[PDB]
């Protein structure tokens, strides 16, 4: 995360770390959406231009974390993967359209003060909150600039109007994405970056005071560049696929 700040303890208890078993390293962020389902970016698991194609047994899920590198005895929980599900129409070839993946855990994880699922938006929450100028929150252990943080970072970013998103980039944008961040004139800044991939963009509903995951950290050109924005998978637009997977294999 660029230009963010250290998270408070328990501030993002749905935060999940995707961890490579060998060598032991961070791979991506991710989120807890129930006691056995983790949500992330497809590109965290499958990105052939980088020779990335992970299978279940390559990975661990670490939940309840704060410190990036420390093993957080009696607090974090580490889970193995039963199954990875990637969107059948995920477009790694061109623009990361439908950049979304689910991971089913072998065993249920115990909720705790540091571990708790985030909500996924229904149509009305999506329509009310995904408005230009409304801010969300994104969290992660990725790069601090375009080194690495000691603990989970947080940054709040305003959603940006679709024409501005499109005009900032040469990439072909779709309805399955939204962009967020400050304009160069707005002063303030911040962005996701390398390693934040797959982590959640959340918003706190003023209707029921619950946190909803509206986006997934997906792509950006560099990090925290003036005139450029972070692009997030539009979780609501792909919810039917999410429900479908969970309904069928859960």
């Amino acid at each position: 995360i660029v230009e963010g700040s250290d998270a408070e303890i328990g501030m993002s208890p749905w935060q999940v770390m995707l961890f490579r078993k060998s060598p032991q390293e961070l791979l991506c962020g991710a989120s807890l959406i129930s006691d056995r389902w983790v949500l992330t970016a497809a590109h965290c698991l499958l990105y052939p231009p980088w020779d990335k194609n992970f299978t279940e047994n390559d990975l661990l899920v670490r939940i309840g974390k704060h410190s990036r590198t420390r093993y957080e005895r009696n607090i974090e929980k580490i889970s193995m993967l039963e199954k990875i599900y990637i969107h059948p129409r995920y477009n790694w070839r061109e623009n990361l359209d439908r950049d979304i993946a689910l991971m089913k855990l072998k065993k249920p994880v115990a909720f705790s003060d540091y571990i708790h699922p985030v909500c996924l938006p229904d149509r009305e929450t999506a329509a009310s909150l995904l408005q230009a100028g409304y801010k969300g929150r994104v969290t992660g252990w990725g790069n601090l600039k375009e080194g690495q943080p000691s603990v989970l970072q947080v940054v709040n970013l305003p959603i940006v109007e679709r024409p501005v998103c499109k005009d900032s980039t040469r990439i072909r944008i779709t309805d399955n994405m939204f962009c967020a961040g400050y304009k160069p004139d707005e002063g303030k800044r911040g962005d996701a970056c390398e390693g934040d991939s797959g982590g959640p963009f959340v918003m706190k509903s003023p209707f029921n005071n619950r946190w909803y995951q509206m986006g997934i950290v997906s792509w950006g050109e560099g990090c925290d560049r003036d005139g450029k924005y972070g692009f997030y998978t539009h979780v609501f637009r792909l919810k039917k696929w999410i429900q479908k997977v969970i309904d069928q294999f859960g």
């Binding site: 961070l26 990036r68 590198t69 093993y71 580490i78």
Partner: peptide
Amino acid sequence: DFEEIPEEY
């Protein structure tokens, strides 16, 4: 950078 994790996982 990373601290090793228990052998179990």
